[PDB]
Structures are given as structure tokens and as C-alpha cells.
Design goal:
heterodimer; A: alpha+beta; Arylsulfatase, C-terminal domain; 2 domains; six-stranded antiparallel β-sheet; 4 helices; 29% strand; B: little secondary structure; 0% helix
Chain lengths: 218, 7
């Protein structure tokens, strides 16, 4: 999926979309391409345990430093464990093995921290009407955190102004959450034709570099 | 930061 996104992104940025004679950004909206999932909270404890996160459906997950993943569903009980090689197992907080006891308490520790401290991003957006993804990989730069979900989506949160990109290669689309927390979803092909403001074009050039890095990290 | 936007 990332090769599809990199090309979608490569075409748009080739358009010079902020250079249109008359930018018509709103003409590039497609409200039915809104994503189903995005990362609504995250905690980087990677010096000790790994990266904990919340998805917009109130499920939570951890990508441990040993490259394993544990997800808790929003029912608060069902777990999915994903090993380094991608092998997937279902367990529950009720009925689980003892070998995961430490990782489950780390998840609960992350879960508790996020509910006590953190604002849920996009809480006013209803997701589109889907298999629950996990965090495949992530990295931080000095200006943003980059989050790659198992369903193909790439999210980039920008630290300075709290703006966020959600890129979906299945829709050839991007969602931009701006400084005022207003969200707009765009078909990237339409952003090529109609153009966009300099701020968004700046973010999309950055996004291309980030997707190159994700692709090269495979 | 080491976590997302706090309340």
C-alpha cells in the first residue's frame, strides 16, 4: 500500500498545487473518504517499554520494543497479540496465558496514563462505516510523529501547531486536521487539479519524504 | 514531547 501512496503523493506534489491560477481547495473535498481509524492519543515510552496509543474507537495498543504488539478492544476485555513475524492470536483479559501478564499490565499502564492525561484527537468526527488495525511501525522527528497502521494508513502529527495528516492509500485520499481542529478529507487527484493553500502543500511535501522513509525501512 | 497533546 505504501508504494501506492508514494505515487499518489508524488503526482500531487508535482502539480505545485499552491501555484494554481485560482486555488479551489474545497472542490477537492470528498466527505465519504473520511477514515474509519486514526490514532487519537500516543505515549512514547520507547526508552523503557515501547509506544502506547489509542485509536479513535477507544481501542488501545502497544508496539513493544521487542517489535511485538498487544491490542485491547474497546470492549475492555478482548486482546490480540501480534508477534514479531506477524503471527496473530486472540486472548482476553479474562482468559489469557501467564506469559503475557507483564505485557498486559504495561498496556493497562499505558491505558491509564492516556485516560488521565491526554486529549482524544478528532473526538468530534464520526468515522466512516473494518478490521481493527495495529501499529506496524512509527518514528519521531523533531517536528512530527509518523504512525503507520496495519490497514495501510499513515498518520503524521505535527508538534508545533497540532495539525495532523491522515493518509489512506486505499482511497487515494488525505484528511487534514488544522490548527482549529477542523477536519477536511480530500481526494488527492482533486487536490492535484484544484490546488491547495501553501500550508497544506508544505505538509504534503513533508509527507512524501516520510513515506519514502517508511518504504525504505522495510 | 514524549506524549500527544495533554488536557
Amino acid at each position: 500500500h505504501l508504494s501506492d501512496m508514494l505515487q499518489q503523493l508524488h503526482s500531487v506534489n508535482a502539480s505545485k498545487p499552491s501555484e494554481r491560477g485560482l486555488v479551489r481547495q474545497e472542490e477537492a473535498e470528498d466527505p465519504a473518504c473520511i477514515p474509519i481509524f486514526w490514532v487519537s492519543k500516543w505515549v512514547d515510552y520507547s526508552d523503557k517499554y515501547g509506544l502506547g496509543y489509542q485509536l479513535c474507537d477507544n481501542s488501545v495498543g502497544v508496539l513493544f520494543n521487542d517489535s511485538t504488539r498487544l491490542i485491547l478492544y474497546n470492549d475492555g476485555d478482548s486482546l490480540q497479540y501480534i508477534e514479531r513475524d506477524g503471527t496473530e492470536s486472540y486472548l482476553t483479559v479474562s482468559s489469557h496465558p501467564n506469559s503475557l501478564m507483564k505485557k498486559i499490565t504495561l498496556l493497562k499502564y499505558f491505558r491509564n496514563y492516556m485516560s488521565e492525561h491526554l486529549l482524544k484527537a478528532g473526538a468530534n468526527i464520526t468515522p466512516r462505516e473494518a478490521r481493527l488495525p495495529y501499529l506496524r511501525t512509527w518514528f519521531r522527528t523533531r517536528s512530527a510523529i509518523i504512525l503507520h497502521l496495519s490497514n495501510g494508513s499513515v498518520q503524521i502529527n505535527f508538534f508545533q501547531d497540532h495539525t495532523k495528516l491522515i493518509l489512506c492509500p486505499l482511497m487515494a485520499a488525505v484528511t487534514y486536521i488544522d490548527e482549529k481542529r477542523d477536519f477536511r478529507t480530500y481526494r488527492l487527484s482533486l487536490l492535484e487539479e484544484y490546488g491547495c493553500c501553501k500550508e497544506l502543500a508544505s505538509r504534503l511535501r513533508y509527507a512524501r519524504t516520510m513515506v519514502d522513509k517508511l518504504l525504505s525501512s522495510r | 514531547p514524549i506524549s500527544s497533546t495533554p488536557l
